[PDB]
Amino acid sequence: LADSSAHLDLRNFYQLRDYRQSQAGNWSQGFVLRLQSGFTGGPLGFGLDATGLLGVKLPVDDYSHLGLTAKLRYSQTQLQVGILMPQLPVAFRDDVRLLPQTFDGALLTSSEIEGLTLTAGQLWKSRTRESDDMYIMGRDKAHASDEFNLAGATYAFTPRLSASYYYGQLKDIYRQHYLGLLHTLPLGEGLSLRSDLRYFDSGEDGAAISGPVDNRNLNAMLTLRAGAHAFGIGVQKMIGNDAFPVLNGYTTPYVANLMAYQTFTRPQEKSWQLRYDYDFAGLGLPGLNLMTRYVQGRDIDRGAGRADDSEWERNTDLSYVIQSGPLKSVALKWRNITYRSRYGADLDENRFIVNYTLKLW
């Protein structure tokens, strides 16, 4: 049993919001207990993981759940059945709040052939700190489905160039095709251009119990890395009459212009991003990083014959991984969020998040 391990992930989360068309605060604490067995010896290996989740309001117990995950392994192929945290282009579980969003399902991954990863899965339920079954975020939770089917392939053509295709199907609600092209171009010592191009095509599926689904999503992130600096531009475009479909539960839309508050995927929205990163290591402060980014959106469809909405958001994050002493490896994050829109809400918000992972064995 020496290959087994246990960890406890701790998250302390404080947010001060000023939302209006009101200054309210929130302090809370997350625990994620991860138990992972090793694998039963032999060609076909067997294992068992357990994931325990607890959210506490700051103290009153707010949310708890315990899930198990059976795992099988053979050569380069793995099957997991039970609690899952998928991080896939058509289902990228949320983890920017207190606790990670989880799913129950079965996920098969296989990397038998050099440079090729194949994925096939089915998710049956979504769980968040807030009566299950899945639906498009923003639509009728009464017209839900217990079956999300996914299949994918990623191929590294060269170590500079890889491509990905994924298919997501929420049975009887929607279908989604994803195409991604990732190109990294070296440009001299400490220099590289990362081109991250993404395309989603979303339509209805089966009985279409939540109504029509019409969205194509074109988005790209170009990132110039230079020594300890990084400079990025993002462009994103919603086409069709619908917002970009994601699974309910604040699942993260896998998109270039995703921000701390808004996703910039509203119906017909066109947006661009500027982002700057700095690693302070060279300056003598390893573990300290600055990220600041700004996204501006327009042409947001408000229907009828109304004027389109428009919006902007700025995010500034200062993050610090403590390098030594009793709190070594404790991570701190200060996030400043500023958001304005023409016809909707305005927001100012500060968050302070402390993360730490304790190894139990």
Author numbering: 3 to 23, 29 to 65, 86 to 157, 161 to 391
Paper excerpt:
To determine if the phylogenetic subdivision of Occ proteins exists at the structural level, we determined X-ray crystal structures for seven Occ family members (OccD2, OccD3, and OccK2–K6). The pores of the proteins within the OccK subfamily show a considerable variation in size and shape, suggesting differences in substrate preferences within subfamilies as well. For OccK channels, conductance values are on average somewhat larger than those of OccD subfamily members, ranging from ∼50 pS for OccK4 to ∼300 pS for OccK1, OccK5, and OccK7. OccK4 was indeed the most efficient phenylacetate uptake channel of the proteins tested; however, the specific activities are very low and, as for vanillate, high substrate concentrations had to be used. Thus, phenylacetate is not a preferred substrate for any of the tested channels.
In such microorganisms, the majority of small molecules are taken up by members of the OprD outer membrane protein family. Here we show that OprD channels require a carboxyl group in the substrate for efficient transport, and based on this we have renamed the family Occ, for outer membrane carboxylate channels. As expected from pairwise sequence identities that range from 35%–50%, the Occ proteins share a similar architecture, with a slightly off-center constriction formed by the inward-folded extracellular loops L3 and L7 and residues in the barrel wall. The transport data demonstrate that Occ channels have a pronounced preference for substrates with a carboxyl group, due to the universal presence of a basic ladder on one side of the barrel wall.
